[PDB]
Amino acid sequence: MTADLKSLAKRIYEAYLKNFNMNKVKARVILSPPFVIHDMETLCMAEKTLVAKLNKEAEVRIFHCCQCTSVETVTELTEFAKAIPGFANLDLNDQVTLLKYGVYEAIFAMLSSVMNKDGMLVAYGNGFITREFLKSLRKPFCDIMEPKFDFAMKFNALELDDSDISLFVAAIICCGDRPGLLNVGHIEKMQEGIVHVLRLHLQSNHPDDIFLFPKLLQKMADLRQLVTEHAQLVQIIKKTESDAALHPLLQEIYRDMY
Numbered sequence: 001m002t003a004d005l006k007s008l009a010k011r012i013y014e015a016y017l018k019n020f021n022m023n024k025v026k027a028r029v030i031l032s033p034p035f036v037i038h039d040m041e042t043l044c045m046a047e048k049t050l051v052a053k054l055n056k057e058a059e060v061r062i063f064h065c066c067q068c069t070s071v072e073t074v075t076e077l078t079e080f081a082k083a084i085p086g087f088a089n090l091d092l093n094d095q096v097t098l099l100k101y102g103v104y105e106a107i108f109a110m111l112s113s114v115m116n117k118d119g120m121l122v123a124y125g126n127g128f129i130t131r132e133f134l135k136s137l138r139k140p141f142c143d144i145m146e147p148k149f150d151f152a153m154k155f156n157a158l159e160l161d162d163s164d165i166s167l168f169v170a171a172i173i174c175c176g177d178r179p180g181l182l183n184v185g186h187i188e189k190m191q192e193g194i195v196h197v198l199r200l201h202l203q204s205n206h207p208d209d210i211f212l213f214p215k216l217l218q219k220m221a222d223l224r225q226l227v228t229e230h231a232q233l234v235q236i237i238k239k240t241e242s243d244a245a246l247h248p249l250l251q252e253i254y255r256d257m258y
């Protein structure tokens with residue numbers, strides 16, 4: 001692994017630590033105290049301390065808070081993408097397409113860092129929602145998070161650190177086979193450079209697992225399918241729930257996606 005490829009992996013890693021408020025090391029520290037949301041009583045208590053200004057059904061209030069975090073994460077991923085060699089040199093329209101299809105694959109990948117089998121760290125490290133509370137919400141809102149917990153438990157078993165995850169997220173953003181891409185050839189070259197660094201980095205950082213790279217390629221495919229199914233559930237909610245309107249930035253991300 002040349003000093004240049006180590007520099008690329010380090011640049012990506014530092015751009016990850018700079019652009020995302022929560023990293024896996026800090027998440028594990030806290031998860032090892034945040035306010036525990038495990039029932040309706042504690043949800044209301046958390047709302048008054050953590051999202052005071054926020055009345056509708058609990059399920060709808062939660063859904064709105066979730067939208068706020070997604071808008072924030074999309075903004076963070078947008079600045080992170082600049083660290084990827086060649087991304088800023090891409091056509092402005094291609095940069096939008098890559099981020100459009102990539103953001104939620106990256107969101108659910110990064111969500112794993114703050115999940116354990118019993119729940120998830122939320123609200124900038126200050127809350128912890130239980131997995132069972134989320135399952136207790138009325139349909140269809142109880143169906144949103146459980147497939148993400150399912151993915152995260154397998155993803156977390158790979159025992160990646162943020163030096164790996166930063167490259168993985170970069171690779172997700174660099175997928176050349178997104179619909180609507182103009183300069184597909186340059187994107188594939190850009191993807192190839194990130195994937196090449198990821199492969200060498202995993203060999204260096206995880207010599208114990210000789211299959212980690214193909215394992216992560218499969219997780220990228222799993223995430224694409226997870227996002228397809230997520231978008232389908234979001235469309236049902238928007239259509240069936242006469243009070244869960246979508247933030248405009250998010251509605252534009254899902255527009256014409258799948």
Ligand SMILES: CC(C)(Sc1ccc(CCN(CCCCC2CCCCC2)C(=O)NC2CCCCC2)cc1)C(=O)O
Nearest residue numbers: 046050062065066067069070073107110111122123234
């Ligand atoms: C909003 C849809 C329509 S569905 C959707 C999408 C994503 C999520 C996960 C949101 N979340 C819980 C945010 C929980 C907020 C908490 C609720 C209880 C009261 C206190 C505040 C969270 O922590 N996300 C992390 C953010 C850091 C980076 C990684 C992801 C939930 C639903 C969308 O598609 O965007």
